[PDB]
Amino acid sequence: CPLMVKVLDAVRGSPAINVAVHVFRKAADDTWEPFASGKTSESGELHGLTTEEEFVEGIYKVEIDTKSYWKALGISPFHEHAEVVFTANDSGPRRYTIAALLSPYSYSTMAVVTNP
Amino acid sequence: CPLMVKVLDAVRGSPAINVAVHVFRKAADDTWEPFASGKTSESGELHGLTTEEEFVEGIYKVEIDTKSYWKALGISPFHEHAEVVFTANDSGPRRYTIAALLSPYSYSTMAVVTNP
Amino acid sequence: CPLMVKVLDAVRGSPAINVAVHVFRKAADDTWEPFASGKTSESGELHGLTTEEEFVEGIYKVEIDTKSYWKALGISPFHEHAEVVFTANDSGPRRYTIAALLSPYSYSTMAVVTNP
Amino acid sequence: CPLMVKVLDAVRGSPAINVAVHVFRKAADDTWEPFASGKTSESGELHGLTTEEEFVEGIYKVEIDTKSYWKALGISPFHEHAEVVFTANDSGPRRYTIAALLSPYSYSTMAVVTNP
Fold first, then answer.
1. In whole angstroms, how far apart are CA B46 and each of A17, B61, B93, B94?
2. Which of A12, A40, A83, C21 is the 20 to 30 A CA-CA neighbour of A103?
3. DSSP A13-43
4. Would the CA dihedral through B27, B30, B32, B33 be positive or negative?
5. Binding site annotation covers D108?
6. Which residue segment(s) compose the domain that B81 sits in?
7. Per the UniProt annotation, where are the glycans attached (chains A, B, C, D)?
8. Rounded to a whole number, what is the distance in Å from the CA of C4 to chain D's nearest CA?
9. Subunits that touch chain A (at least 3 Cβ pairs < 8 angstroms)?
10. Could you tell me the CATH number of the domain that includes residue B107?
């Protein structure tokens, strides 16, 4: 559990279920290499993306596919996706929870970072 | 205009128009006394609530009638209203903008305090 | 667990620990009667406030004592407290998670409502 | 002015001044091509990015240099930058305001889309 993503739906007051999430890591040649992906569960949470060993220092991008979520609810949202870009593990291994609260024309995102 | 209120609708990506706003000031006996009120304009803003002379240091509450706003859109909301409670402090010249971003099950509020 | 409160600190990227929370329920004479209170744990969470039996239909106010939290960190925040006011259980018993994300001049609050 | 960006600082309750903002438009080959850029004004706003003629339908990215903003205040931030990605749609006349509310470990963004 060094990386967990949680997504909530501010319209329904619920977890955002079946939201696709793609994680990327910046490579040596400055491109975004695919790192891990998954979908949020019935709790709005996505666990198991990576391991402590694999989640090395680097610049990571978490891309939450909000448009597809809204569209399947009948809403035409503003954003294509929510993107969260951050340096990880640069002072040693940490645990990151990336949370997103979604509305059709707005989101917020928060990171909780803990040292195990 | 030392106090302005702005209300935005995160479902429709618009100003929140015709929202009732009530301002109170905490009295000596610790009750909330009516101070100012109005309805947001087409821009989601409510100007002209008070004056520099009248807006003395004290504890204020801004109550925003969110429930009625959502009910008029046919959307079931969580909150009865949104409440913003703060102390006004003389600390050189100051203007307060209270912003609220509304979703059915969530709101965020921000205060922007500036000196012209 | 019909009522849980979670508080996060957007400055530190952490749970907001030792935050006082007071819950009130609107009485028959339209006053706010004390209902329950507590403090957030090391996880930022406050569990055990009430029981399914005691948490009847009504209008509830959750008052999160944000000012005192900030002040003990050396920050002079804007708000006195964050207040969350809502009708509960009016279509039968539900479980409510009230979350707050705190910054010195801003907060957001979200409710997750589930039917057990 | 079909596109305006506003950036606010939730730690200090102020406009976020002198923040670099870069706008990109998605090209045919799926890369992000520079489109407009500037730095926020004393009001936290960036006006004059584009024109109605130039701002055709397409996918845009607004990148806000949050990290440099926080570093200048001596505050350690989580994100590399804040990114807002959206489709511009002709649907009668329209003006887009992209707002971002910044905290060290969190941001929220809102789009206000209006027709004069």
1. 37, 15, 21, 18
2. C21
3. TEE--S-EEEEEEE-TTS-EEEEEEEE--TT
4. negative
5. yes
6. 1-116
7. 89
8. 22
9. B, C, D
10. 2.60.40.180
Per the CB < 8 Å rule, is A101 touching B106? yes
Which residues, in sequence order, are CB contacts of C59 under 8 Å at separation 6+? B80, C25, C26, C85, C86, C87, C88
Question: Tokens for D1?
Answer: 């002015």
Interface residue A12 vs chain B (CB under 8 A): yes
Which residues lie closer than 8 Å to C66 by C-beta, 6 or more apart?
Answer: C19, C77, C79, C80, C81, C82, C100, C102, C107
**Experiment used for this model:** X-ray
Q: How far apart are CA A20 and CA B26, in angstroms?
A: 48
Residue of B nearest to D7 (CA): B112
| Distance separating alpha carbons of residues A83 and A21, to the nearest angstrom | 10
For residue B9, the chain A residues in CB contact (below 8 A) are: 105
Q: Could you tell me which residues come within 8 angstroms of residue B51 by beta carbon, excluding any fewer than 6 positions away?
A: B2
B61 is in an annotated binding site: no
Residues in chain B: 116
Across the A/D interface, how many CB contacts are shorter than 8 Å? 50
| Environment class of C16 (CB within 10 Å of its CB; exposed 0-12, middle 13-18, buried 19+) | buried
Query: For D13, which of B8, B10, B112 is closest by C-beta distance?
Result: B112
The experimental resolution of this structure, in angstroms, equals 1.2
Place of tokens 């645990």: A95
Q: What is the DSSP letter of C18?
A: S
CB atoms within 10 A of CB B6: 20
Query: In the structure encoding, which two tokens stand for residue A43, read together?
Result: 């709790």
CB count within 10 Å of CB B33 equals 10
H/E run at residue B96: strand B95-103
Any known ligand binding at B45?
Answer: yes
Query: What residues form DSSP beta bridges with D82?
Result: D64
